[PDB]
Amino acid sequence: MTEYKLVVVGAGGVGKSALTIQLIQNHFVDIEDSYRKQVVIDGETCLLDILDTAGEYSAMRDQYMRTGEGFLCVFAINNTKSFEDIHHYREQIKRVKDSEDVPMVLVGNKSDLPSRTVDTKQAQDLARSYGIPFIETSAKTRQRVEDAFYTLVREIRQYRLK
Ligand SMILES: N[C@H]1CC[C@@H](N2CCCCCN3/C(=N/S(=O)(=O)c4cnc(N[C@H]5CCNC5)c(c4)C2=O)Sc2c(Cl)ccc(O)c23)CC1
Ligand SMILES: Nc1nc2c(ncn2[C@@H]2O[C@H](COP(=O)(O)OP(=O)(O)NP(=O)(O)O)[C@@H](O)[C@H]2O)c(=O)[nH]1
Ligand SMILES: [Co+2]
Numbered sequence: 001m002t003e004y005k006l007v008v009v010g011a012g013g014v015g016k017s018a019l020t021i022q023l024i025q026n027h028f029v030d031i032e033d034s035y036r037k038q039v040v041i042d043g044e045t046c047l048l049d050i051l052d053t054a055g056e057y058s059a060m061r062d063q064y065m066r067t068g069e070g071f072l073c074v075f076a077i078n079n080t081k082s083f084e085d086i087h088h089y090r091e092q093i094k095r096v097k098d099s100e101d102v103p104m105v106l107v108g109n110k111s112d113l114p115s116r117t118v119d120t121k122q123a124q125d126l127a128r129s130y131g132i133p134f135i136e137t138s139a140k141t142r143q144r145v146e147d148a149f150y151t152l153v154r155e156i157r158q159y160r161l162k
Protein backbone atom coordinates (compact mmCIF):
# COMPACT_ATOMS: atom_id res chain seq x y z
CA MET A 1 0.00 0.00 0.00
CA THR A 2 1.50 3.40 -0.96
CA GLU A 3 2.71 5.28 2.12
CA TYR A 4 3.29 9.08 2.33
CA LYS A 5 5.50 10.65 5.00
CA LEU A 6 3.87 14.08 5.73
CA VAL A 7 5.44 16.68 8.03
CA VAL A 8 3.57 19.64 9.62
CA VAL A 9 5.95 22.57 10.35
CA GLY A 10 5.55 26.18 11.48
CA ALA A 11 6.00 28.55 14.36
CA GLY A 12 4.78 28.04 17.92
CA GLY A 13 0.99 28.10 18.42
CA VAL A 14 -0.04 28.25 14.75
CA GLY A 15 -2.15 25.12 15.09
CA LYS A 16 0.10 22.26 13.84
CA SER A 17 -1.14 19.80 16.51
CA ALA A 18 -4.78 20.99 16.19
CA LEU A 19 -4.74 20.51 12.38
CA THR A 20 -3.24 17.00 12.73
CA ILE A 21 -5.71 15.89 15.51
CA GLN A 22 -8.58 17.33 13.48
CA LEU A 23 -7.57 15.14 10.47
CA ILE A 24 -7.07 12.06 12.70
CA GLN A 25 -9.88 12.38 15.31
CA ASN A 26 -12.31 14.81 13.57
CA HIS A 27 -12.05 16.65 16.91
CA PHE A 28 -10.73 20.07 17.97
CA VAL A 29 -8.21 19.50 20.76
CA ASP A 30 -8.79 21.66 23.83
CA ILE A 31 3.45 15.93 22.85
CA GLU A 32 4.89 15.85 19.31
CA ASP A 33 4.29 12.47 17.73
CA SER A 34 3.30 10.69 14.50
CA TYR A 35 -0.19 9.61 13.39
CA ARG A 36 -1.36 7.10 10.80
CA LYS A 37 -4.48 7.20 8.64
CA GLN A 38 -5.46 5.17 5.54
CA VAL A 39 -7.41 7.34 3.06
CA VAL A 40 -8.60 7.11 -0.58
CA ILE A 41 -7.57 10.17 -2.71
CA ASP A 42 -8.49 10.21 -6.47
CA GLY A 43 -9.51 6.48 -6.34
CA GLU A 44 -6.08 5.46 -4.94
CA THR A 45 -5.76 4.12 -1.38
CA CYS A 46 -2.71 5.18 0.61
CA LEU A 47 -1.40 5.36 4.12
CA LEU A 48 -0.62 8.77 5.54
CA ASP A 49 2.17 8.81 8.15
CA ILE A 50 2.09 12.31 9.67
CA LEU A 51 4.76 13.86 11.92
CA ASP A 52 3.65 16.79 14.17
CA THR A 53 6.74 18.95 14.78
CA ALA A 54 7.59 21.58 17.39
CA GLY A 55 7.79 25.34 16.73
CA GLU A 56 14.09 20.29 18.69
CA TYR A 57 17.57 18.91 18.18
CA SER A 58 19.01 20.08 14.83
CA ALA A 59 20.19 16.61 13.70
CA MET A 60 16.61 15.29 14.36
CA ARG A 61 15.05 18.26 12.47
CA ASP A 62 17.32 17.46 9.51
CA GLN A 63 16.28 13.77 9.72
CA TYR A 64 12.54 14.53 9.56
CA MET A 65 13.24 16.95 6.72
CA ARG A 66 15.23 14.22 4.89
CA THR A 67 12.53 11.55 5.53
CA GLY A 68 9.55 13.85 4.84
CA GLU A 69 8.00 13.55 1.38
CA GLY A 70 5.65 16.53 1.68
CA PHE A 71 5.47 19.51 4.04
CA LEU A 72 2.55 21.52 5.36
CA CYS A 73 4.05 24.94 6.11
CA VAL A 74 1.62 26.47 8.59
CA PHE A 75 1.24 30.07 9.68
CA ALA A 76 -1.66 31.64 11.64
CA ILE A 77 -3.66 34.47 9.93
CA ASN A 78 -3.44 36.57 13.14
CA ASN A 79 0.35 36.14 13.53
CA THR A 80 2.57 38.14 11.13
CA LYS A 81 5.82 36.69 12.56
CA SER A 82 4.53 33.13 11.84
CA PHE A 83 3.89 34.12 8.20
CA GLU A 84 7.31 35.81 7.81
CA ASP A 85 8.89 32.67 9.39
CA ILE A 86 7.60 30.52 6.46
CA HIS A 87 10.73 31.72 4.56
CA HIS A 88 12.92 30.00 7.23
CA TYR A 89 11.04 26.63 7.26
CA ARG A 90 11.03 26.54 3.41
CA GLU A 91 14.77 27.43 3.28
CA GLN A 92 15.67 24.73 5.89
CA ILE A 93 13.67 21.99 3.99
CA LYS A 94 15.14 22.91 0.56
CA ARG A 95 18.67 22.92 2.08
CA VAL A 96 18.31 19.43 3.67
CA LYS A 97 16.61 18.01 0.51
CA ASP A 98 19.19 19.79 -1.73
CA SER A 99 16.29 20.52 -4.10
CA GLU A 100 14.35 23.67 -5.17
CA ASP A 101 11.41 21.38 -5.80
CA VAL A 102 9.91 19.83 -2.62
CA PRO A 103 6.14 19.04 -2.30
CA MET A 104 4.77 21.69 0.05
CA VAL A 105 1.45 23.43 0.77
CA LEU A 106 1.23 26.81 2.50
CA VAL A 107 -1.48 26.81 5.16
CA GLY A 108 -2.98 29.88 6.81
CA ASN A 109 -4.68 28.48 9.89
CA LYS A 110 -7.28 30.15 12.26
CA SER A 111 -9.39 31.41 9.28
CA ASP A 112 -12.34 31.49 11.78
CA LEU A 113 -10.71 34.37 13.71
CA PRO A 114 -11.76 38.07 13.17
CA SER A 115 -8.28 39.36 14.13
CA ARG A 116 -6.63 38.77 10.71
CA THR A 117 -3.18 40.47 10.35
CA VAL A 118 -2.20 38.53 7.18
CA ASP A 119 -4.28 39.26 4.01
CA THR A 120 -5.31 36.24 1.91
CA LYS A 121 -3.84 38.05 -1.15
CA GLN A 122 -0.39 38.49 0.54
CA ALA A 123 -0.16 34.73 1.34
CA GLN A 124 -1.56 33.84 -2.12
CA ASP A 125 1.13 35.92 -3.85
CA LEU A 126 3.90 34.39 -1.65
CA ALA A 127 2.64 30.85 -2.46
CA ARG A 128 2.65 31.78 -6.18
CA SER A 129 6.28 32.99 -5.84
CA TYR A 130 7.13 29.60 -4.22
CA GLY A 131 5.14 27.63 -6.88
CA ILE A 132 3.09 25.87 -4.17
CA PRO A 133 -0.63 25.71 -3.30
CA PHE A 134 -2.08 27.97 -0.61
CA ILE A 135 -5.11 27.01 1.55
CA GLU A 136 -6.65 28.75 4.51
CA THR A 137 -7.95 26.44 7.22
CA SER A 138 -9.66 26.41 10.60
CA ALA A 139 -8.68 23.51 12.89
CA LYS A 140 -11.51 24.82 15.17
CA THR A 141 -14.33 24.40 12.58
CA ARG A 142 -12.52 21.80 10.31
CA GLN A 143 -12.82 24.23 7.38
CA ARG A 144 -10.49 22.99 4.55
CA VAL A 145 -8.43 20.73 6.89
CA GLU A 146 -8.76 17.60 4.72
CA ASP A 147 -8.21 19.79 1.59
CA ALA A 148 -4.84 20.95 3.01
CA PHE A 149 -3.54 17.42 3.70
CA TYR A 150 -5.07 15.85 0.51
CA THR A 151 -3.67 18.72 -1.65
CA LEU A 152 -0.22 17.90 -0.14
CA VAL A 153 -0.64 14.21 -1.12
CA ARG A 154 -1.64 15.29 -4.68
CA GLU A 155 1.53 17.45 -4.87
CA ILE A 156 3.66 14.45 -3.80
CA ARG A 157 1.96 12.31 -6.50
CA GLN A 158 2.53 15.03 -9.16
CA TYR A 159 6.19 15.24 -8.04
CA ARG A 160 6.64 11.44 -8.39
CA LEU A 161 5.59 11.62 -12.05
CA LYS A 162 8.42 14.16 -12.83
N1 LIG B 1 7.19 7.75 20.02
C1 LIG B 1 8.21 8.42 20.85
C2 LIG B 1 9.59 8.09 20.22
C3 LIG B 1 9.60 8.71 18.86
C4 LIG B 1 9.38 10.23 18.96
N2 LIG B 1 9.71 10.87 17.65
C5 LIG B 1 8.66 11.34 16.74
C6 LIG B 1 7.92 10.27 15.93
C7 LIG B 1 8.76 9.63 14.81
C8 LIG B 1 7.93 8.97 13.86
C9 LIG B 1 8.77 8.32 12.75
N3 LIG B 1 9.26 9.35 11.75
C10 LIG B 1 10.51 9.82 11.74
N4 LIG B 1 11.50 9.44 12.52
S1 LIG B 1 12.81 10.20 12.75
O1 LIG B 1 13.15 10.85 11.47
O2 LIG B 1 13.83 9.27 13.30
C11 LIG B 1 12.33 11.25 13.94
C12 LIG B 1 12.24 12.63 13.66
N5 LIG B 1 11.76 13.41 14.66
C13 LIG B 1 11.37 13.00 15.85
N6 LIG B 1 10.93 13.88 16.78
C14 LIG B 1 10.98 15.34 16.51
C15 LIG B 1 9.78 15.61 15.72
C16 LIG B 1 8.85 15.92 16.88
N7 LIG B 1 9.62 16.90 17.64
C17 LIG B 1 10.93 16.27 17.76
C18 LIG B 1 11.45 11.61 16.18
C19 LIG B 1 11.87 10.76 15.18
C20 LIG B 1 11.02 11.03 17.38
O3 LIG B 1 11.88 10.69 18.22
S2 LIG B 1 10.64 11.00 10.51
C21 LIG B 1 9.06 10.85 10.09
C22 LIG B 1 8.37 11.53 9.13
CL1 LIG B 1 9.24 12.71 8.18
C23 LIG B 1 7.03 11.34 8.89
C24 LIG B 1 6.33 10.38 9.66
C25 LIG B 1 7.06 9.71 10.62
O4 LIG B 1 6.32 8.76 11.32
C26 LIG B 1 8.40 9.89 10.86
C27 LIG B 1 7.97 10.49 19.45
C28 LIG B 1 7.93 9.93 20.88
N1 LIG C 1 -9.51 29.90 16.81
C1 LIG C 1 -8.64 28.92 16.53
N2 LIG C 1 -7.76 28.54 17.43
C2 LIG C 1 -6.96 27.53 16.98
C3 LIG C 1 -6.95 26.99 15.74
N3 LIG C 1 -5.96 26.02 15.67
C4 LIG C 1 -5.37 26.06 16.82
N4 LIG C 1 -5.95 26.96 17.68
C5 LIG C 1 -5.51 27.26 19.03
O1 LIG C 1 -4.18 27.71 18.98
C6 LIG C 1 -3.46 27.34 20.16
C7 LIG C 1 -2.23 26.57 19.75
O2 LIG C 1 -2.69 25.38 19.02
P1 LIG C 1 -1.75 24.08 18.77
O3 LIG C 1 -2.42 23.14 17.84
O4 LIG C 1 -1.15 23.77 20.04
O5 LIG C 1 -0.51 24.73 17.97
P2 LIG C 1 0.96 24.28 17.74
O6 LIG C 1 1.38 24.86 16.42
O7 LIG C 1 0.85 22.73 17.57
N5 LIG C 1 1.88 24.61 19.01
P3 LIG C 1 3.42 24.25 19.23
O8 LIG C 1 4.39 24.67 18.23
O9 LIG C 1 3.83 24.56 20.56
O10 LIG C 1 3.53 22.77 19.25
C8 LIG C 1 -4.45 26.54 21.01
O11 LIG C 1 -5.06 27.40 21.95
C9 LIG C 1 -5.43 26.05 19.95
O12 LIG C 1 -6.68 25.83 20.52
C10 LIG C 1 -7.89 27.41 14.78
O13 LIG C 1 -8.02 27.08 13.62
N6 LIG C 1 -8.68 28.47 15.25
CO1 LIG D 1 -12.72 17.44 23.56
Ligand SMILES: [Co+2]
Pocket residue numbers: 087088091
Ligand atom coordinates in the same frame (compact mmCIF):
# COMPACT_ATOMS: atom_id res chain seq x y z
CO1 LIG E 1 17.02 33.08 4.50
Ligand SMILES: [Mg+2]
Pocket residue numbers: 016017018052053054
Ligand atom coordinates in the same frame (compact mmCIF):
# COMPACT_ATOMS: atom_id res chain seq x y z
MG1 LIG F 1 1.97 21.29 18.75
